[PDB]
């Protein structure tokens, strides 16, 4: 393991693949979420910008406080309505924007955090726009649309949102989502499926959902989070990671290929990194097919 990983263990073949590639510049991934920080020293040398829909009215920035409130109540592990009534009491008019945000800097941490930082992602050399939405299916489609326009290769997301899909599926861009195109469920720290995990099994991989750790706003101290939307950037950053292999050898970005070759080698199954670099690069076996 030249690149020690959180996930490593987690992940066979995680430590052979950032052996041969963190990424390349060349591969352009669009996440559309909120409003990540890039003060935060894991985006330090991160080929990270945003670019905010001009469509949207600019909302007013939120506080550190208000951030810290939100970290406080996290932190003491609040839950059902314990936790409503906490965040009702301190920011009421602020939360929602601030879970999108907040979101926004740990999936952005877990795909391209530097290394030796305190967040290393899945696949820090490659280039990164976020798309924030916090400013709020058309407005989504909208998105899309831009994204493409932007030059992604990957979409990280969460009848007009139905085409816009489609034409990425056309264009050789590939779309990554959580369950609640590449559908991605969260498994637990032993390769099981979470509970809470939700076409999803057709066309859906299984990968590690539980205890990601990630970067949270305002401060240097990272969290580990839980969710399918967790586990989604994880097979995004993969999914970088193997179209970077893909420039690497001299070949062109294929999307199509990447999907197939995860999902061919719980829905359909958990990751595996090493059944889906043989069918891209190696001899597979026709039993695969």
């Not at 996930?7 to 693949?17: F, H, N, S, T, V």
């Not at 669009?30 to 935060?40: A, F, Q, R, S």
């Not at 509970?195 to 969290?223: D, M, R, W």
Request: charged share 20%; hydrophobic share 40%.
């Amino acid at each position: 393991a030249l690149h020690p990983h959180d996930l490593d263990e987690r992940i066979p073949g995680l430590a052979d693949l950032h052996n041969q590639t963190l990424g390349d510049p060349q591969i352009t991934i669009v996440i559309i979420d909120g409003d990540p920080d890039y003060t935060l020293s894991c985006f330090e040398g991160a080929e990270v910008s945003k670019v905010f829909p001009y469509w949207h009215e600019p909302a007013e920035p939120i506080t550190p406080e208000d951030y810290a409130a939100f970290q406080s109540i996290r932190d003491q592990g609040l839950k059902g309505k314990e936790k409503e009534e906490a965040l009702e009491a301190v920011i009421p008019d602020t939360k929602d924007r601030i879970v999108l945000n907040d979101h926004a800097c740990h999936v952005t941490s877990t795909i391209v955090g530097q290394e030796h930082s305190p967040v290393f992602g899945i696949a820090p050399n490659c280039r990164v726009i976020n798309m924030p939405q916090d400013a709020v299916p058309l407005n989504l489609a909208r998105a899309i649309d831009l994204a493409l326009e932007l030059g992604a290769n990957i979409i990280h997301c969460a009848e007009i949102l139905v085409q816009a899909i489609k034409k990425c599926q056309d264009n050789n861009v590939l779309i990554v989502s959580p369950t609640g195109t590449l559908a991605v469920g969260a498994a637990k720290v032993d390769g099981t499926p979470c509970h809470f995990s939700n076409n999803n099994t057709k066309e859906g991989i299984l990968a590690p959902g539980e205890e990601i750790l990630g970067a949270q706003p305002c401060t240097e101290e990272p969290v580990r989070l839980t969710g399918t939307s967790m586990a989604a950037p994880v097979m995004t950053g993969i999914s970088a990671l193997l179209m970077s292999l893909q420039v690497q050898q001299g070949k062109p970005v294929d999307a199509e290929a990447v999907r197939t070759a995860l999902l061919k080698t719980c829905l359909r199954g958990f990751v595996n990194i090493p059944g889906a670099m043989k069918v891209l690069f190696g001899q597979p076996s026709v039993t695969v097919s």
